[PDB]
Amino acid sequence: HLPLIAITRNPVFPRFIKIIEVKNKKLVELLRRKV
């Protein structure tokens, strides 16, 4: 029950490490709520 992430054009194939860098800064507040 968490808001859908902004993929912002970033495929993540299974068992494949990947990095996410969304341009909106609002998601960082969600990042601080998951720590």
């Binding site: 993540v12 299974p14 068992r15 990947k18």
Partner: peptide, 14 residues
């Protein structure tokens, strides 16, 4: 991010 647990929710709206 990594791919560890796949899942297919029947309805994301709920």
């Amino acid at each position: 991010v990594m791919g560890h647990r796949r899942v297919h929710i029947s309805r994301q709206l709920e």
